[PDB]
Each structure stands twice: as structure tokens, then as C-alpha cells.
Amino acid sequence: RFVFPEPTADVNYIVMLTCAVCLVTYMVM
Amino acid sequence: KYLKSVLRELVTYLLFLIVLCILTYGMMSSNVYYYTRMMSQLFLDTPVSKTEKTNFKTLSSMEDFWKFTEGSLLDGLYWKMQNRSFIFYENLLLGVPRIRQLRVRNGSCSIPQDLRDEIKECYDVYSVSSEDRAPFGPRNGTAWIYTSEKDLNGSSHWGIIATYSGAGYYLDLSRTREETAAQVASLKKNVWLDRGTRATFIDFSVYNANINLFCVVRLLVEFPATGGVIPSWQFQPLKLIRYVTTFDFFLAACEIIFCFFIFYYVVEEILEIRIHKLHYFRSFWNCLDVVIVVLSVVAIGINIYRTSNVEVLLQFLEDQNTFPNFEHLAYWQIQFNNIAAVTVFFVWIKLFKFINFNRTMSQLSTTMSRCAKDLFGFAIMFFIIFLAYAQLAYLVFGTQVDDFSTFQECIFTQFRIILGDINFAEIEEANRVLGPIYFTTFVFFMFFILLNMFLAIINDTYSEVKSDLAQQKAEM
Ligand SMILES: *[C@@H]1O[C@H](CO)[C@@H](O)[C@H](O)[C@H]1NC(C)=O
Ligand SMILES: *[C@@H]1O[C@H](CO)[C@@H](O)[C@H](O)[C@H]1NC(C)=O
Ligand SMILES: *[C@@H]1O[C@H](CO)[C@@H](O)[C@H](O)[C@H]1NC(C)=O
Fold this sequence. Notes:
This is part of a larger assembly, with chains A and B. Chain A has one helix spanning about 15-29. Chain A is mostly helical. Chain A is built from 1 helix and no strands. Chain B has 14 helices and 5 strands. Chain B has a 5-stranded antiparallel sheet, with helices on both faces. In chain B, α9 (about 360-370) crosses α14 and α10 (about 370-395) runs antiparallel to α14 (about 450-475). Chain B starts with 5 loop residues before the first helix and ends with a helix. Classes of the chains: A mainly alpha, B alpha+beta. At the A-B interface, loops of A face loops of B. The complex binds 2-acetamido-2-deoxy-beta-D-glucopyranose (3 copies). Chain A: It comes from Homo sapiens.
């Protein structure tokens, strides 16, 4: 009931942008 | 004091600089240039056939590749001696060249059912999870059977479109043209470059026994899923049999002295960090030493990893009728050069600490240092607008210009425009509404206004510094 996919290398920019925004706002705040 | 303590601290740096300069002059000679130049011009600057003018450098179709592989390639590998095959009657073609193919499988993507009457198959872009592994065509030899990455001793390549693996369908070529041409014809008849192929590699190496410099040659051809051909090449002058002449022992001795010097510096830095002031990072003169020592120790580690790893040469020398695997050595040589070239830069930069021997240099250094605290803010505010323009250009023109086809390419294009090299003669064709507007706004706001604050700040800082240092004489 678990899997280590690692299928491809095409990154998904949505998660990266969300995390970057959430850390930048924390830094400035 | 401040004089009897610095004199040793200066001569120890001068000897370090001398040793580093000896090393740099040692590794880079003036014979590698012409070697690589003729080697490149032999394969890249010659047409595939006398009836056309399309060289390997400007391939444009799947068909042109077949014309190349039997043509200017075979004509530049096998030279009849007036059996061995000397390229320029000096270069020795050691081993045999190897060709390799990377391809994807049928039905690798999905198509909608409403138009699944005309689209019979799709070949998705290259991916490790979509790479074919089944035997296709006539199942005779290694050219129609998949082979794992560890069974070829290969590795990744990082091409232009993607990062290709070391696996694929490979084939070893003969030593005489008479059989290599037959093998290539056999590959071409039973279709081997199908619609599913995505990458092709050709590898070999030469010796050129006069000087002691191996030269490894790799040629990549990439087939994007949207159609087209993208060529790439790499010629690397390795050296693996160093110890022959006295200069080689000289270089080894200088390397040993360099290791001793870096050990001395790291010891005197640990002693200073631990047995003296802690958290002494507000100097920029000690944050430079750590960078230098880290880069040097990385270079030494890479050298120990690579130089001690030469058994592949011994294996090739056992039997010399098999493809030599020198790909890793070239990669590590490139990485070592990319580290040494930055290490020498910082070593040269560090010299600025030692030039304060009179009033003029001291005041120039004071002006340059005091002007860095406030230029930092404007640099950030300027780079923010720079990246704003970069992303705007990438989003708008980054689909039809090909100078803005990538973010870093956009940055380089903007810097070139700043130098005054690129003209917008193609941007109007790319776009007529937002083209001239963007060009005019960028060349006006960031070349008439933003770029002069840098002059203003420096001019004001220098003026106030000189005035203060002149007033420093009205009190004395
Ligand atoms: C590729 O796959 C399709 C359906 O997945 C099928 O027509 C056949 O196996 C292949 N296409 C051709 C033209 O052979
Ligand atoms: C493949 O093998 C068959 C029989 O083993 C042989 O006749 C043929 O020449 C080989 N090569 C091909 C089909 O290219
Ligand atoms: C890969 O390395 C092994 C290790 O000895 C060697 O025997 C072999 O010839 C090399 N090449 C291939 C294609 O397996």
C-alpha cells in the first residue's frame, strides 16, 4: 500500500511556485 | 608591527601564485588547439557528398543522417596507408567506433477517441519510463536487442533537449571500411532509424603518437518528437600516459608542492578560526580564503578520483579489437578544468589585499569598498526590473524568435542589447504591437535612466571620500 514512483523528470512548476511563495511571504512577514 | 608580519604572509602568497601559474601554463599547451581544430574540420566542415553542401553541422532530416554515416564519416575514419588506420598519417584510430540508438515504444501516449480514427499511433517524447525495451525487426544481433545501462558501462549525457541514459541498441563497427560500409548498408536496408527513434550516438578515439594526447570524439544527433534534427559534437584532448619526459616529473613535483601549500593554508585557517576570533565572517577577506581552499580541495579530490582510475586503458591494451570506454575520463577532465579555471581566478582576485603601498592606491581601495555598501541596494532593485523584462520577453516572444526561446537566453539577449549588438529587425515579424513598444521601453528606461544611477553613486562616493581625506590634513 505504498509506491516510490520516480517515473519521469518533467517537474511540476505548480508545487514549486506554491512553496516558493509560501516561504518568501514567511521571510518578509 | 604590521610590516615584519605581512612580509612572510606576502611571500607565501607569491610562491603560491607562482606554483599555480606554473600549473596553468603546464596543462594548457599550444598544440591542443590545432589538434582539435583539424580533428573538428575533418568531420564537421566537410559536405556529406560532393553533390550537395549539407555538412553534419547543418543536418535537417532523417535521410541526411544516412547520407552522412556512409560518406564523410567513413571517408574520415579509414585512410589507406602508403590493419591499422592512421587518420592524418599521425593520428592512430585505436579500437573501433561504436554507434548507438535510443528510442521509445509504440503507443507511449494517449489520444482522444473522437479523433482516434486517423491517429493510429503516437510516439511520446523521450522519458526513462517510456523507453522501449523489446526486440524489434530481425532479432539477429546486439543491434536489435535492448541492453541495460550497466552492461555498457555508460552514463548520462545531458543533451540539448533532455538527459539521455546510457542504455539503448548499440553496434560495434569493423576496422576496415570494406566491412563497416556493409554493416551500415545492412542497418539501412532493414529500417533501423524508424519513427520511434529519439537519439543517436557515435563514439571513437584517436592517439596521435607524436605528442602524448589522446583525443576522444563523440557525436550526438537528437530527434525531437515534433520533427527535426539537432546535431552536437564533442572532441576532448585527454592525456593518460603523463610520465615520459622530465617536464612531467617537474609538473608532478609542482603538484606535490601545491598540495603542501593548500594543507598549510587550511591548517593556518583552522588555527585562526578556533584559537582566535570566532565568527570572523564580516571581513570578505576571510570569506574568500574559505572559497579558495574549498575549491582547491575539491579539485584535488577530483584529481585523485580520476587519475587513479585508469584501468580501462589497461583493459584496452589487453585486447585492441574492442571499443575503448573513455567517456567518463573526458567528463571528469572537463569538470576538473571548470574548477581549476575558477580557482585561478579567485587566487588572482585575492591579490588586491596587497596593494596599499601609497596614498593613491589606499584611497582608491577606500572609495571602492565604501561604494559597495550602497550599490548593493540599487543592484537588487535593477536586477528585479531586469528579470521582469526577461520574463515578459520570454512569455511574449519566447515562441517564435528563438533568441528569447529560453529564460537564460532572454537574459543573454538583454545583455547583448545593452552592449549594443542585437537589432530588432526580426521582432516586428515576431510581433508588431508589443515588439517595438518593449524594445523602446527597455532601451529608454534601462539605458538612459537606470544605468546612470551607477555612475552617480560612484561619482558622489569618490568625491566625498577625496574631500574627507583632503580635510584630514586641516587637522594635522
Ligand atoms: C502502433 O500501435 C497501434 C495501436 O496502438 C497499432 O496500429 C500498431 O500496433 C502500431 N501501428 C502500426 C502502424 O503498426
Ligand atoms: C539475420 O539472420 C538471418 C538468418 O539467421 C540471415 O539470413 C540474415 O542475413 C541476417 N541479417 C539480416 C536479416 O539483416
Ligand atoms: C563493460 O565493463 C565490463 C567490465 O569488465 C567489460 O567486461 C565489458 O567489456 C565492458 N563493455 C561492455 C559492452 O560490456
